[PDB]
Amino acid sequence: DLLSCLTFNGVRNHTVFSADSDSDFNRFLHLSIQNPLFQNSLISKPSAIILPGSKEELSNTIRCIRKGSWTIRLRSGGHSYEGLSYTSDTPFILIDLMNLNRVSIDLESETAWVESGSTLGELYYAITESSSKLGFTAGWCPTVGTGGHISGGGFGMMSRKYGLAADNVVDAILIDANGAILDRQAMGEDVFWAIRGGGGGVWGAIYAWKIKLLPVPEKVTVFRVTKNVAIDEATSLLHKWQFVAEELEEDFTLSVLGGADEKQVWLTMLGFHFGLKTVAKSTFDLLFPELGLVEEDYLEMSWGESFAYLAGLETVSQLNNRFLKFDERAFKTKVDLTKEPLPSKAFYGLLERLSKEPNGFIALNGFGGQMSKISSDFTPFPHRSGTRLMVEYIVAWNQSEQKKKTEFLDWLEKVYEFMKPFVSKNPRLGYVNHIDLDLGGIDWGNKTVVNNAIEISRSWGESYFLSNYERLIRAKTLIDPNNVFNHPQSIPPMANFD
Numbered sequence: 094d095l096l097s098c099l100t101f102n103g104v105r106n107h108t109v110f111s112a113d114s115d116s117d118f119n120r121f122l123h124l125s126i127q128n129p130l131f132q133n134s135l136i137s138k139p140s141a142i143i144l145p146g147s148k149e150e151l152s153n154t155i156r157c158i159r160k161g162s163w164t165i166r167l168r169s170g171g172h173s174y175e176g177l178s179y180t181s182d183t184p185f186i187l188i189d190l191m192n193l194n195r196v197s198i199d200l201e202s203e204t205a206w207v208e209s210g211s212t213l214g215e216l217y218y219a220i221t222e223s224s225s226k227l228g229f230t231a232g233w234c235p236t237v238g239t240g241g242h243i244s245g246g247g248f249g250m251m252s253r254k255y256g257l258a259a260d261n262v263v264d265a266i267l268i269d270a271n272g273a274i275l276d277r278q279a280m281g282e283d284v285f286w287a288i289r290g291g292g293g294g295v296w297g298a299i300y301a302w303k304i305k306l307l308p309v310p311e312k313v314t315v316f317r318v319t320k321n322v323a324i325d326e327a328t329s330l331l332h333k334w335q336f337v338a339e340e341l342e343e344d345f346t347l348s349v350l351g352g353a354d355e356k357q358v359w360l361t362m363l364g365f366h367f368g369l370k371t372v373a374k375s376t377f378d379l380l381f382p383e384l385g386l387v388e389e390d391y392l393e394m395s396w397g398e399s400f401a402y403l404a405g406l407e408t409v410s411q412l413n414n415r416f417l418k419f420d421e422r423a424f425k426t427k428v429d430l431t432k433e434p435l436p437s438k439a440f441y442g443l444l445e446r447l448s449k450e451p452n453g454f455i456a457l458n459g460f461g462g463q464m465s466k467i468s469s470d471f472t473p474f475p476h477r478s479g480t481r482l483m484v485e486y487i488v489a490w491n492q493s494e495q496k497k498k499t500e501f502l503d504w505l506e507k508v509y510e511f512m513k514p515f516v517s518k519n520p521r522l523g524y525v526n527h528i529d530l531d532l533g534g535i536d537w538g539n540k541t542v543v544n545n546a547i548e549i550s551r552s553w554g555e556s557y558f559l560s561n562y563e564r565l566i567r568a569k570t571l572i573d574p575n576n577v578f579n580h581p582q583s584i585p586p587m588a589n590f591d
């Protein structure tokens with residue numbers, strides 16, 4: 094009996110299923126559903142939601158759930174593009190980690206222990222409060238949870254300088270399928286490697302991450318400038334952008350958000366420099382004068398301020414608000430990684446397609462810099478040297494546009510097909526933090542599929558992990574041979590014939 098088990102172990106914060114919009118259950122379920130695509134009444138719902146308040150409670154929660162037949166779901170920030178932290182085709186218990194959001198900074202070692210329910214914003218805020226000369230490399234969305242994000246890699250505006258969040262993890266506490274509480278020494282190097290990018294919801298429950306804090310200057314420079322242009326100019330800008338993104342030294346990042354509506358194209362240029370505005374502007378004046386940036390576009394501020402600003406927040410304080418919703422639209426997104434430069438026609442066609450669907454947008458990031466200096470097998474994220482760009486295609490809509498859902502999905506499908514020739518091939522590469530079920534999924538309830546799970550899974554597995562897929566399967570067998578942590582695209586354990 095689950096409830097008696099939780100009570101016996103003093104895991105007191107839990108609620109059982111109820112449809113009442115008023116119920117604490119429904120409120121907690123919806124609190125961290127960060128893609129409204131998955132909020133409706135016909136979606137699968139948990140039989141109970143448990144909010145463990147310590148590593149011991151998390152351990153005992155897993156143990157209690159194991160006594161029954163339920164599927165475990167872990168949720169940190171709830172940002173799964175495919176809602177995989179709070180949906181399941183089989184009855185399930187949702188372990189919501191929002192109360193495990195403590196950040197402990199050690200300024201003597203310049204490291205931090207970060208409970209896995211902490212959001213990126215909570216982490217950034219904690220760091221800024223402790224020091225004006227330390228930061229951390231992770232994504233730009235402040236409400237993303239560290240649990241999912243670091244488990245999948247974690248790319249952001251400082252990745253060209255410092256790599257992924259997962260590339261800067263030096264220890265972690267993993268709670269395994271039997272509730273065992275394991276640090277790096279206890280879990281071993283294969284498992285410690287797998288958790289640093291091998292995907293959330295696969296290895297066990299991360300309780301906390303120990304991260305290395307990273308130097309930042311007291312003043313950095315950023316800009317966020319939207320150019321309103323026509324398609325010919327936008328194409329010229331994007332085509333040159335891909336090279337500048339690369340010719341820039343690691344102390345600079347220039348990224349782009351873009352979209353259109355008939356004749357009008359908008360390109361939002363996001364810039365970050367590890368340094369002062371005189372140097373930042375001089376560099377873009379020389380390398381990319383076509384951007385037409387002026388002195389007033391460049392803002393000098395602290396690292397903490399810069400991360401709040403790039404996210405469009407009003408204040409650094411807002412980083413610490415995990416429930417602040419800046420964009421409450423349902424969305425679907427796909428992503429590509431490139432190995433060869435994109436021809437101008439690829440950007441032209443992308444822009445033409447965006448002009449026909451104003452609810453669509455693209456997000457463009459260059460790799461290079463430190464991303465090319467990290468070996469493909471340092472952590473499970475393999476897209477290092479030779480990888481040029483990450484290109485994201487997004488379509489998003491509010492509730493008033495819900496009837497157009499299929500139209501938006503059609504547009505996104507067509508955009509991804511259009512880009513096929515220009516982007517990585519054999520296989521077409523992906524990124525596990527941009528999990529995409531279009532690639533397929535495992536029905537763990539189907540014996541025939543399960544027998545063939547490894548090779549069925551190679552489709553998306555090689556896309557996300559390339560040559561690292563094999564070691565991930567070895568690590569999965571080590572830490573979760575009974576496949577307690579599973580989802581449609583989780584790494585399968587090795588075939589066993591005992």
Ligand SMILES: *[C@@H]1O[C@H](CO)[C@@H](O[C@@H]2O[C@H](CO)[C@@H](O[C@@H]3O[C@H](CO)[C@@H](O)[C@H](O[C@H]4O[C@H](CO)[C@@H](O)[C@H](O)[C@@H]4O[C@H]4O[C@H](CO)[C@@H](O)[C@H](O)[C@@H]4O[C@H]4O[C@H](CO)[C@@H](O)[C@H](O)[C@@H]4O)[C@@H]3O)[C@H](O)[C@H]2NC(C)=O)[C@H](O)[C@H]1NC(C)=O
Pocket residue numbers: 105106107124144191192
């Ligand atoms: C399972 O987990 C969930 C998720 O964590 C739990 O739900 C959370 O429960 C929290 C309470 O335990 C609740 O926090 C509350 O959040 C509200 C905002 O919605 C916040 O205003 C509350 O903060 C007040 O109360 C706490 C003590 O509970 C104080 O520490 C705090 O200082 C606040 O009191 C002050 O402000 C109040 C007005 O807001 C005044 O009425 C009060 O007098 C006091 O004012 C004095 O101090 C002020 C500051 O110096 C000063 O300005 C003033 O003049 C006075 O001197 C409270 O923290 C969360 O909202 C809730 N989270 C969610 C998602 O629902 C849940 O309880 C758990 N369930 C179980 C079974 O354990």
Ligand SMILES: *Cc1cc2c(c(*)c1C)N[C@]1(NC(=O)NC1=O)C(=O)N2C[C@H](O)[C@H](O)[C@H](O)COP(=O)(O)OP(=O)(O)OC[C@H]1O[C@@H](n2cnc3c(N)ncnc32)[C@H](O)[C@@H]1O
Pocket residue numbers: 127166167168169170171172173174176177178190209210231232233234236237238239240241242244245247248249292293294295297298299300526527580
């Ligand atoms: C919603 C959103 C997502 C992203 C971005 C912004 C916004 C608003 N921006 C990103 N773009 C970038 O270039 N960099 C960004 O950060 C982006 O990539 N992005 C997607 C997120 O990074 C990922 O979706 C990330 O995995 C989400 O993390 P989180 O909020 O924790 O997501 P969850 O749905 O709770 O979990 C994801 C998977 O991981 C498992 N999991 C959660 N917590 C776990 C712990 N503690 N241990 C083990 N596994 C855990 C979940 O079960 C789920 O499978």
Ligand SMILES: *[C@@H]1O[C@H](CO)[C@@H](O)[C@H](O)[C@H]1NC(C)=O
Pocket residue numbers: 539540541542
């Ligand atoms: C199991 O999977 C196989 C392969 O996808 C499929 O042919 C079959 O219909 C499935 N069986 C069940 C019980 O759904």
